[PDB]
């Protein structure tokens, strides 16, 4: 048995590989849920900053999901539950930065504001229950109005009504929110047309 | 057992392109030998084939089938059956392998966008930009295209392979000032990396003949919102009675849209001061001199690989003025340390390179290339007598040797000793350098890159600009090799035989060796 020594020295790679290789070669090795869950947190703790490669975070998600079904009896099911939530929020934060980048560049070469709305909508659909739903929704609303401004004169009223639909959808989703003031100026500009 | 006569050809399913144009692009006619590849290679493999003519235009939801009918006697009648789907819109872009570089840095240089229609030229251009950026390996890049026929969209995976660029001197290539002044969440003992910004420091600490300090910083996306860049630098140096030089500069670059979108304009403003007493290798001997210079440079760059380019070109046209104090703006050894409190000149340059493959390429990508160079320069003067003692050209040899001094511009001319064509009292106010090269690489890899070449140079320089003559040159020839190191720049070996004489003497010609370091 070695993994816990590597875990105490914060060498997460060796701790992780000495734990997992032992409970892969025999379903519990001889340390059972302790090795599994130490390996799960060790794999979690190497997590990069939210805009690097993310390779270990998908692996962490699937490893914790498969832990929940190898040992559903464990009290560490909760400790994996909130961990997979934290990982999901980081994965969503990456996509949120992507959508923010497309809003920042804007109507530069290409379009980039239609890209912003579809990127953040993909975020909303791929991870339904994240914290960042408010930020993603307001980013949709801002990008909708931004597209409505610069569109060709034959195709502006439809973008305006899409913007007002997003306004009422944001109110339906969040009857109160800290971002309502800018939303309401967007509404007051678009409801005229 | 097969037939051998092409009796007719036919098309069905097409709407997007005219049937006669596809007859031409299929390169067939009735009354010709029946084959299979003759059709297939021209319909499913080659870059002008019909299938590629649909695929590259974003119509990826397609299929195709050569139908054979009337299989009688010697003949077959043929009909092209194809499927036209809906033009694919990009749904997602996934990028992986970026160990040490935020996605912010790379997604801003992509030419494709989510929500726009797919096209081959945009994807190829995006890969060219990534290759030229240099933070990833220029080889072993290929996109993982995945379509979805139910929603009719495509998502692109970009697997990338990383390499770190760093070399007394230091070449931090992905160093961030925002991460320096305010760490994100944990600096964790690491340098403040990211954002694609670069920082560089260099200097000599010999101090008994040479001493120097220098620093530079470059931000390719200033403000993080547009492709316009900021560049700043500064320097200082002693050399043994001594000579003192220091200065700084600030510059600003911008991508253009007029001829094409490869052109980049650059503007820069610079300051320098020279400090001397009882010094002797310059015409100036005692005093202090200044210069303010404004530079405009127009450049175009279209190559594929920085380290061993194989297609494209690199053109530059530059002009560098300092205000004309001799005219009414400023109006009024014998008196030469006089009147050069402020120095005056206007320097012009043209510089072009041109890389072609000679054996197809793409296939057997090790390839073989022919290069080509053509550099001209002029250091003009507003007034016949107040010619600048600083900024002159120095030519002959490796070129690197001249960076023991910073008041001149050193130009390599291979096969002629060092600084041979421009000795003391004959400083160069105009020059020309031409020359072919044929190159073959031995190895191209992430860590190290190797290639061998034979050249054919020709160059010259003049002390008097009015005697510029680009058809009277000191010819050369030779062979050489170069090495790129995992944690250092180039090192290479060049041998050359100088053919013509210099100033009536053959002493500097003949066999010569040059030892290149860093980068030309």
Best CA proximity match to B203, nearest among B216, B193, B215: B215
B116 touches chain A (CB under 8 A): yes
Contact flag A52-B98 (C-beta cutoff 8 Å): yes
Q: Which helix (H) or strand (E) holds B131?
A: helix B120-133
Contact at 8 Å (CB) between B369 and B358? yes
Contact flag B91-A118 (C-beta cutoff 8 Å): yes
Measured in residues, chain A has a length of 193
Nearest CB to A49 within list B108, B185, B224: B185
Tell me the C-alpha distance between A91 and B194, whole Å.
19
The token duo for B269 is 């403003």
Q: Nearest C-alpha of chain B: how many angstroms from A127?
A: 15
Gaps after residue numbers in chain B (C–N over 2.5 angstroms): 167, 240, 332
Measured in residues, chain B has a length of 520
Chain centroid to Cα B132, Å, comes to 8
The token duo for B279 is 């010094």
Mutation target for B interface from A95, A106, A109, A146: give the one with most B CBs within 10 A: A109
Best CA proximity match to B163, nearest among B445, B480, B481: B445
Contact flag A115-B115 (C-beta cutoff 8 Å): yes
B501-to-B498, B507, B514 alpha-carbon distances in Å: 8, 8, 19
Q: Nearest C-alpha of chain A: how many angstroms from B56?
A: 19
Mutation target for A interface from B103, B153, B156, B186: give the one with most A CBs within 10 A: B103
Residue entry with tokens 């962490």: A60
Contact flag B115-A51 (C-beta cutoff 8 Å): no
Torsions phi, psi of B374, nearest 5?
Answer: -160, 95
Resolution of the determined structure in angstroms stands at: 3.5
Contact flag A115-B226 (C-beta cutoff 8 Å): no
Residue B315: beta bridge partners? B300, B352
Which of chain B's residues have a Cβ under 8 Å away from the Cβ of A55? 96
Which of chain A's residues have a Cβ under 8 Å away from the Cβ of B108? 101, 105
Q: Provide DSSP, B276-309.
A: EES--SSS--SEEEEEEEEEEEEEEE--S-SSS-
Which of chain B's residues have a Cβ under 8 Å away from the Cβ of A51? 102-104
Contact flag A108-B226 (C-beta cutoff 8 Å): yes
The token duo for B192 is 């403040």
The token duo for B156 is 């692109």
Tell me the C-alpha distance between A31 and A23, whole Å.
8
Chains A, B: CB pairs < 8 Å:
53
Which of chain A's residues have a Cβ under 8 Å away from the Cβ of B111? 110
For residue B251, give every residue at least 6 positions away whose Cβ sits within 8 Å of its Cβ, in sequence order, or none: B230, B231, B232, B266, B267, B268, B269, B295
Contact at 8 Å (CB) between B175 and B192? yes
Chain centroid to Cα A34, Å, comes to 28
The token duo for B501 is 């004489």
Closest residue in B to A112 (Cα–Cα): B113
Contact flag B225-A105 (C-beta cutoff 8 Å): yes
Tell me the C-alpha distance between B20 and B37, whole Å.
21
Q: Chain B 190-229, CB below 8 Å of chain A: which residues?
A: 224-226
Which of chain A's residues have a Cβ under 8 Å away from the Cβ of B125? none
In the three-class reduction of DSSP (H, G, I as helix; E, B as strand; rest coil), residue B362 is classed as coil
Tell me the C-alpha distance between B106 and B164, whole Å.
16
Q: Chain B 83-112, CB below 8 Å of chain A: which residues?
A: 91-92, 96-100, 102-104, 107-108, 111
Q: Nearest C-alpha of chain A: how many angstroms from B224?
A: 8
Contact flag A112-B92 (C-beta cutoff 8 Å): no
Best CA proximity match to B12, nearest among B82, B61, B86: B82
């Amino acid at each position: 048995m070695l993994g816990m020594s590597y875990y105490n020295q914060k060498d997460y790679q060796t701790a992780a590989q000495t734990f997992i290789t032992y409970f892969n070669t025999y379903p519990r090795g001889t340390f059972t849920e302790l090795a599994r869950f130490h390996a799960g947190k060790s794999l979690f703790l190497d997590t990069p900053e939210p805009r690097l490669d993310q390779s270990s975070t998908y692996q962490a998600i699937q490893q914790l999901q498969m832990f929940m079904e190898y040992f559903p009896n464990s009290t560490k099911k909760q400790e994996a539950q909130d961990m997979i939530f934290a990982l999901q929020d980081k994965l969503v934060l990456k996509e949120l930065y992507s959508a923010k980048l497309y809003y920042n560049l804007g109507n530069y070469l290409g379009n980039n504001y239609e890209s912003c709305v579809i990127t953040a909508q993909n975020a909303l659909k791929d991870y339904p229950y994240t914290d960042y739903r408010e930020e993603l929704s307001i980013l949709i609303l801002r990008a909708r109005h931004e597209m409505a401004i610069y569109s060709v004169e034959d195709k502006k009223m439809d973008r305006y009504r899409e913007t007002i639909d997003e306004y009422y959808a944001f109110k339906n989703e969040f009857p109160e929110s800290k971002y309502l003031k800018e939303a309401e100026k967007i509404f007051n500009e678009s409801q005229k047309v | 057992g097969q037939k051998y006569y092409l009796r007719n050809v036919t098309w069905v399913g097409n709407t997007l392109y005219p049937s006669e144009q596809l007859n031409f692009l299929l390169r067939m006619k009735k009354g010709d030998v029946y084959n299979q590849k003759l059709l297939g290679e021209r319909t499913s493999t080659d870059d002008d084939a019909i299938g590629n003519l649909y695929y590259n235009n974003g119509y990826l939801f397609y299929n195709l089938d050569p139908v054979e009918v009337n299989i009688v006697g010697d003949s077959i009648d043929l009909e092209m059956r194809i499927y036209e789907g809906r033009q694919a819109t990009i749904n997602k872009i996934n990028i992986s392998g970026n160990d040490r570089l935020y996605e912010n840095v790379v997604r801003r240089e992509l030419r494709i966008r989510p929500g726009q229609l797919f096209s081959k030229d945009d994807l190829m251009r995006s890969l060219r930009e990534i290759q030229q950026m240099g933070h990833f390996d220029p080889e072993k890049l290929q996109p993982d295209i995945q379509p979805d026929p139910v929603n009719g969209t495509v998502d692109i995976g970009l697997p990338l392979t990383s390499k770190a660029n760093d070399q007394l001197s230091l070449k931090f290539t992905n160093f961030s000032v925002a991460n320096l002044l305010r760490p994100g969440e944990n600096y964790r003992g690491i340098l403040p990396q990211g954002d694609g910004q670069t920082l560089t420091i260099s200097g000599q600490t010999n101090a008994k003949y040479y001493q120097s300090y220098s620093i530079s910083f470059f931000d390719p996306w200033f403000g993080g919102k547009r492709p316009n860049s900021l560049s700043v630098s500064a320097f200082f140096s002693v050399q043994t009675k001594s000579i003192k030089m220091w200065g700084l500069s600030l510059g600003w670059g911008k991508r253009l849209k007029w001829p094409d979108d490869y052109f980049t304009l650059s503007a820069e403003l610079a300051y320098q001061r020279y400090n001397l007493k009882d010094w002797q290798y310059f015409p100036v001997t005692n005093g202090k001199c200044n210069d303010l210079s404004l530079s405009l440079t127009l450049a175009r760059n279209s190559i594929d690989n920085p380290i061993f380019p194989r297609t494209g070109s690199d053109f530059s046209l530059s002009v560098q003025l300092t205000p004309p104090y001799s005219l009414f703006d400023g109006k009024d050894q014998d008196n030469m340390n006089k009147l050069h409190r402020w120095v005056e000149y206007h320097k012009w340059k043209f510089k072009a390179k041109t890389y072609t493959p000679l054996m197809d390429y793409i296939a057997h990508p090790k390839c073989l290339v022919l290069m080509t160079r053509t550099e001209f320069g002029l250091l003009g003067h507003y007034n016949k007598y107040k010619k600048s003692p600083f900024g002159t050209f120095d030519v002959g040899g490796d070129g690197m040797t001249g960076y023991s001094s910073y008041a001149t511009e050193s130009i390599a001319l291979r096969g002629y000793e060092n600084s041979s064509l421009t000795p003391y009292g004959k400083e160069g106010y105009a020059y020309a350098r031409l020359g072919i090269e044929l190159r073959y690489p031995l190895m191209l890899e992430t860590s190290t890159n190797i290639y061998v070449l034979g050249f054919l140079e020709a160059g010259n320089a003049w002390h008097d600009i009015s005697k510029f003559n680009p058809f009277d040159l000191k010819r050369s020839a030779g062979i050489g090799v170069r090495i790129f190191l995992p944690m250092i720049g180039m090192m290479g070996i060049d041998w050359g035989y100088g053919f013509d004489k210099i100033n009536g003497s053959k002493e500097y010609g003949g066999s010569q060796f040059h030892f290149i370091l860093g980068q030309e």
